[PDB]
Design a protein around this nucleic acid. Structure first.
Lengths: 394, 394
RNA sequence: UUUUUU
RNA sequence: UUUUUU
RNA sequence: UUUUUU
């Protein structure tokens, strides 16, 4: 009897799940105009409550699969969503021409029926759907950080993609109320985030403007709320050709339960295949075992070692109960790393003139990264002070 | 269990993709006049929105394959676009004589139907189509740099090809509004850029004026947004006959994760075969793994070493967070390279008179490249100051 | 709960 | 995001 | 892009 196996119980799911959901699909002869009516109903602020996930699935099936519902069901999006517990009931209506005529006759859709009579539609192309999905992909990196972080990252990606000349969005899409409602409809829908992630990752070759925007934004969403995974696996568990060895600041007996617990949490997380970098955004099952408050010493030490290697990770906020250990591991790794690079410069040169040139280069390089780290720290302090002045103002 | 394989997940596409697109093809008895009507509809500023990609495919099939649609489907352009996820639905209309009569009866094409009634057509030859495609190939090098860089490179290629006597373009094609709209229609279309790249690379022998312009402009587009690939693979990972060895400025332990990560990104990029130099323009799948912000030390060091070897790479702009490391690696490589050429001049001579002549030659050659590098730096500084004075003026 | 850069 | 030359 | 002579 192993009594210590009781501390790992109640984490892993045991079976594939018998929970079944129901999202509707619209089968219409006028699918492009139906889809554009869903776009301008969402953009107008109409809370289209239980029909949101089915309407967003009709936009994504219409854009990616020409709304045929036959090669959609063969496709691995639907195989994944069928194993996740979704069921597609197809609301077939061949003579429908408006969004009101396809909503089923239930009593609780009556605020939506009253809301959509006053909704005016401007006639628009098929490409407004792909414009909407490429705009919705811009909220995907820094989605789990908040709404202000998502809206600022998405505004920065709008100006980056408009200097490229790839896209241009309308000016009433870029107001802060509308970017609040698009953050709201993206954070809650699993199917919208998953099919933006799937068509971002798995499209190889023929990219239009929208496919390239979605593929660029899914590429910046990799390990989004999982900075602890990236800092521990790069800087704490170094891999050699001989094998994985620990770091000197984690190689004691106070830390070793967190290290052995973190390796079990990572081996749980890698059951998800190619969606393990997107685990915090898609809210997968191993997500509770990788928080900062489960590893209070491993996380602050790993961020201090990571900040000592790179300039930009001195902008990462932590809680007040992790700051001083982060600052201490930063100082210790600065001293250890200057000892190591002095030994390596003495190892790889050939003359005294060669080691004089390489010594002058690596001391100038270290002074460059230290001055950049202090610049990032000063603008982080001013950003926190400006946010606190806005919170005091509001 | 290799836990470090989780950091490479979510990058490579797993399957050939089940996303299918629909571009139309026009099958008409009067294909030359239909194609010239698409040329003067595009040149007039008519936003021919969803029919743009099919109209450009009809121009390219009419120019390259005589619009027969039977040897087009055997040809490897269509095999590549069929594996990319395109489907060609052929709008057969044997008695059509205008561009209005072949547009399908949909409600969202009605601004285009109203736009094309007022469009006047001048009757023109088959060679205005090849004139349009050779003009569209001139935006292909420096396409990913911007619109002003594309329009200035394309104006320079117009004057180069008119001193040759190969071509002459009409004077209303060379205004900046029209070159803005041809940059706009080339940046977004995958099929136009791909078939200009395919017929530029794979045409061996019988070139007319337009084929030679397209082949010259596709030859200058090789590694267009991939300067990091060219500078690292030339100057940082030197190949000997014995094998690949690193550079002394990247041979430490702070750099080795970026070097081993860059070799994985290059081995991803070389899955695309002969279209791997054109990966940033065609937006292929390995493109996110080769940015400057993923390798902040390898890229600035590699550009400094490259600038020390050649005069013209002192015109490359970088961000402000990479400039000083570029300047430092430039200084270190200047000192290391003068030590190496002094040793090689002592190795390859036979007398003292021979080494006196070779010493005087190589010191004059180094002074020539240093004065050229300072000239490039001064005109770069004045170009940036003039662009900032125009941005302040506008 | 997450916080940087890209 | 990309930035030079050809 | 090419630049001479024959």
């Amino acid at each position: 009897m192993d009594l210590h196996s009781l501390l790992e119980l109640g984490t892993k799911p045991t079976a594939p799940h018998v929970r079944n959901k129901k999202v509707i699909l619209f089968d219409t002869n006028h699918q492009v105009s139906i889809c554009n009516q869903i776009i301008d109903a969402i953009n107008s602020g109409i809370d289209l409550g239980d029909l949101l996930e089915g309407g967003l699935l009709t936009l994504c099936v219409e854009h990616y699969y020409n709304s045929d519902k036959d090669k959609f069901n063969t496709s691995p999006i639907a195989k994944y969503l069928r194993d996740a517990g979704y069921e597609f009931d197809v609301i077939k209506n061949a003579d429908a021409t408006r969004f009101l005529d396809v909503i089923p006759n239930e009593p609780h859709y009556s605020p939506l029926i009253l809301a959509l009579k006053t909704l005016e539609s401007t006639e628009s192309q098929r490409g407004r759907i792909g414009l909407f999905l490429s705009f919705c992909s811009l909220f995907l990196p820094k989605l789990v950080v908040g709404d202000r972080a998502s809206i600022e990252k998405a505004l920065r990606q709008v100006t980056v993609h408009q200097e490229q000349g790839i896209v241009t969005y309308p000016n009433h899409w870029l107001t802060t109320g509308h970017m609040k409602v698009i953050f709201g409809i993206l954070r809650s829908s699993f199917i919208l985030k998953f099919v933006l992630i799937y068509q971002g990752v798995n499209l190889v070759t023929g990219h239009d403007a929208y496919d390239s925007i979605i593929s660029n934004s899914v590429g910046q969403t990799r390990f989004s709320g999982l900075l602890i995974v990236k800092t521990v696996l790069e800087f704490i568990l170094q891999k050699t050709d001989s094998g994985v060895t620990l770091h000197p600041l984690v190689r004691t007996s106070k830390v070793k339960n967190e290290v052995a617990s973190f390796k079990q949490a990572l081996s749980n997380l890698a059951r998800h295949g190619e969606y393990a970098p997107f685990a915090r955004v898609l809210n997968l099952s191993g997500i509770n075992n990788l928080e900062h408050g489960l590893y209070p010493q491993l996380s602050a030490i790993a961020l201090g070692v990571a900040t000592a290697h790179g300039s930009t990770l001195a902008g990462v906020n932590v809680g007040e109960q992790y700051q001083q250990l982060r600052e201490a591991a930063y100082d210790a790794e600065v001293k250890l790393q200057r000892r190591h690079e002095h030994q390596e410069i003495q190892a790889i040169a050939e003359d005294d003139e060669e080691r004089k040139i390489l010594e002058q280069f690596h001391l100038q390089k270290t002074e460059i990264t230290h001055s950049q780290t202090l610049a990032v720290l000063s603008q982080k302090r001013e950003k926190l002070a400006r946010l606190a002045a806005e919170i005091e103002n509001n």
